[PDB]
C-alpha cells in the first residue's frame, strides 16, 4: 500500500509515511502574481543545454523521466537566484485527466493542463542523493503547458511513450534536445520549496517560468495513455499525477520581471 495519486494513497495520505508533507517549505504553491515582489537584484537565468546527453526514458509508476548523463557539466543551470552550478539529471511532467487541470503550481489559482520539471542538482554536493539532503541541493525549472498549437520539440517524447506504457519499462532515448521544450522568455518566479512527491524533501530552489509552452490536444492525449500499473496488472491510466498547492507559510515569492 504505497503512495500514489488514487483515493486511498493520494496527496492527503502522504503525511502518514512522510511527515515533512506538513512542513514549512512544501511545494507546489499558488503564485499570487500581485503579491510576488519584483527583485531587481535577481540575475537572468543561464540555461546551457547545448552539450546535453539524454540517455533513456523510464516510466517509474508516477510519471516518466527523460534521464541525462550528469557525470560531467554538460547541461547546466546557473544564475537567476542560484549560487553555483546545477547539473540537469532528468525532466518529467505532471498532467491532468482533462485540459483544465494537471499543473502543480498555479498562477492566481489558474491550473494549466500540465507542468514540465527540469531537475538539476548542485555540483558542490557531488551527486544527486547527497544534494537532496541539503536545503540548496536542487534547482527545478518549472514550465507550464497549455493546450493549443503543437510543440514540435515535444513530439519525439510523445512518440516513444507507447514503448514505456507501464511501470518499470524503459527505452533508449538518445540525442533529445531539451532546448526544444523552452518558451521564448526566461522571465520567472522563484521561492524555496520541496520535492512535490515523496520523499517531499525540502531541498529545492524552484524557478517557475511565466510564459507557458503550447502543446496540442493530441500530444497531451498521448500522455494520458500511459499507465501507473505494471504490465500484467489491472490498467489504471496515468492521469492526475499532480500534488495540489500547499500553504505558503513564511515564504516570499520573488519575480525576475516587472
DSSP letter string over 193-252? E--SSTT--S-EEEEEESSPEEE-HHHHHHHTT-BSSPTTS---B-----PPP----S--
Determine contact, residues 251/187, Cβ cutoff 8 Å. Answer: no
Please check if 190 is assigned to a binding site: no
167 near Zn ion (CB under 5 A): no
Terminal Cα distance for the chain, rounded: 47
Choose the one of Zn ion, ligand 8GH, none that binds residue 195, judging by a C-beta under 5 to 8 angstroms depending on kind. ligand 8GH
- With contacts defined by CB under 6 A, name the span among 51-59, 147-155, 175-183, 195-203 that binds ligand 8GH: 195-203
Report whether 197 belongs to an annotated binding site: yes
92 is in an annotated binding site: yes
Applying CB under 6 A, among 25, 105, 117, 169 the residue interacting with ligand 8GH is 117
Q: Is 18 a residue that touches ligand 8GH (CB under 6 A)?
A: no
State yes or no: residue 140 binds ligand 8GH (CB under 6 A): yes
Least Å distance between CB 78 and ligand 8GH?
18
Alpha-helical regions (H) of 5-162: 14-17, 128-131, 155-160
**Can you tell me the distance from the alpha carbon of 37 to that of 51, in angstroms, rounded to the nearest whole number?**
34
Candidates 201, 204, 205, 200; CA nearest to 190 is 205
Active site residue 34: no
Out of 196, 219, 241, 246, name the contact with ligand 8GH by CB under 6 A.
196
Site string for Zn ion, 15-54 (x = CB under 5 A): ----------------------------------------
Alpha-carbon distance of 86 to 216, in angstroms, equals: 31
The residues assigned a catalytic role are 62
Please enumerate, by residue number, every residue annotated as part of a binding site for Zn(2+): 92, 94, 117
Binding site for Zn ion (CB under 5 A): 117
Amino acid at each position: 500500500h504505497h503512495w500514489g495519486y488514487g483515493k486511498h494513497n493520494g496527496p492527503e495520505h502522504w503525511h502518514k509515511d512522510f511527515p515533512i508533507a506538513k512542513g514549512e517549505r512544501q511545494s507546489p504553491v499558488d503564485i499570487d502574481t500581485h503579491t510576488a515582489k519584483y527583485d531587481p537584484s535577481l540575475k537572468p537565468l543561464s540555461v546551457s543545454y547545448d552539450q546535453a546527453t539524454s540517455l533513456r526514458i523510464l516510466n517509474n509508476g508516477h510519471a516518466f523521466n527523460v534521464e541525462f548523463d550528469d557525470s560531467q557539466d554538460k547541461a547546466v543551470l546557473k544564475g537567476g537566484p542560484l549560487d553555483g552550478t546545477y547539473r540537469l539529471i532528468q525532466f518529467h511532467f505532471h498532467w491532468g485527466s482533462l485540459d483544465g487541470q494537471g499543473s502543480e503550481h498555479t498562477v492566481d489559482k489558474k491550473k494549466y493542463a500540465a507542468e514540465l520539471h527540469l531537475v538539476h542538482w548542485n555540483t558542490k554536493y557531488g551527486d544527486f542523493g547527497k544534494a537532496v539532503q541539503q536545503p540548496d541541493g536542487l534547482a527545478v525549472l518549472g514550465i507550464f503547458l497549455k493546450v493549443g498549437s503543437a510543440k514540435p520539440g515535444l513530439q519525439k517524447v510523445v512518440d516513444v511513450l507507447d514503448s514505456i506504457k507501464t511501470k518499470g519499462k524503459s527505452a533508449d532515448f538518445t540525442n533529445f534536445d531539451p532546448r526544444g521544450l523552452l518558451p521564448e522568455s526566461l522571465d520567472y518566479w522563484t521561492y524555496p520549496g520541496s520535492l512535490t512527491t515523496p520523499p517531499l524533501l525540502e531541498c529545492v530552489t524552484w524557478i517557475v517560468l511565466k510564459e507557458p509552452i503550447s502543446v496540442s490536444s493530441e500530444q497531451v492525449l498521448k500522455f494520458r495513455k500511459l499507465n501507473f500499473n505494471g504490465e500484467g496488472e489491472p490498467e489504471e491510466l496515468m492521469v492526475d499525477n499532480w500534488r495540489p498547492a500547499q500553504p505558503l507559510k513564511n515564504r516570499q515569492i520573488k519575480a525576475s520581471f516587472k
